């Protein structure tokens, strides 16, 4: 019928990971990070690296029979930053452009109900 | 020690906190020699 999968996108200020699994999430179809497509550490979170990684992952998924994906995008969350990095939107657009259908889109960033204590001390980074 | 909020003003002097620390260091030495 229709083999649908899930695209997990992990976006921070330092890198971006695109991981395509099946519908139940227990089997991995493809996985690509920003550091596997560029050579400079400064370019890992750039939108262009996100586009390249998304295209590679989409090709690998398409050759195995997947037709469409539902998208789950997350920032680091927890006691770290709650805002996704600059590579999320570029990654989302690149998956569609490569030939996959797109299902529903949502963000799954973990949010504490007053959890643990973050780093830096009571004054934070002083730069 | 007694409070002198005038001392905390920074114009023309060093920080009162560290002066207090230095004085307390000095008072330990006198006390030790007194017990001998």
């Amino acid at each position: 019928k229709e083999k649908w999968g899930i695209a997990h996108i992990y976006s921070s200020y330092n890198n971006t990971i695109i991981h395509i699994t099946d519908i139940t999430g227990a089997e991995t179809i493809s996985r690509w990070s920003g550091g596997m497509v560029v050579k400079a550490d400064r370019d890992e979170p750039s939108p262009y690296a996100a586009m390249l990684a998304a295209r590679r992952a989409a090709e690998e998924a398409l050759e195995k029979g997947i037709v469409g994906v539902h998208i789950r995008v997350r920032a680091p969350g927890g006691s770290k930053s709650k805002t996704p990095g600059p590579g999320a939107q570029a990654a989302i657009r690149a998956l569609a452009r490569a030939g996959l259908k797109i299902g529903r889109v949502e963000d799954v960033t973990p949010i504490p109900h007053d959890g643990t204590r973050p780093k830096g001390g009571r004054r934070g980074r002083r730069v | 020690m007694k409070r002198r909020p005038r001392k905390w003003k920074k114009k023309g002097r060093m920080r009162w906190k560290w002066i207090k620390k230095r004085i307390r260091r000095l008072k330990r030495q006198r006390k030790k020699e007194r017990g001998l």
Binding site: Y48, M51, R93, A94, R97 | -
Partner: protein, 65 residues
């Protein structure tokens, strides 16, 4: 391998560190995404009606005020 021609239809404003770059809106004339309107950054004097040769058509410049 040869690029795709695009036509400038609107001038937005100057930008760059020393005011050397202009931001424009262009319309693709040929290729997979023919007809779409996207914004781009151009170096050099430019006016409405000029034709640019884009090497790829999936990057869009960030909007400036």
């Amino acid at each position: 391998d040869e690029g795709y021609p695009a036509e400038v239809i609107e001038i937005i404003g100057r930008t760059g560190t020393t005011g050397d770059v202009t931001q424009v809106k262009v319309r693709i004339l040929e290729g997979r995404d023919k007809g779409r309107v996207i914004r781009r950054n151009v170096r050099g004097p430019v006016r409405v009606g000029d034709i640019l040769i884009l090497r790829e058509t999936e990057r869009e410049a960030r909007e400036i005020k």
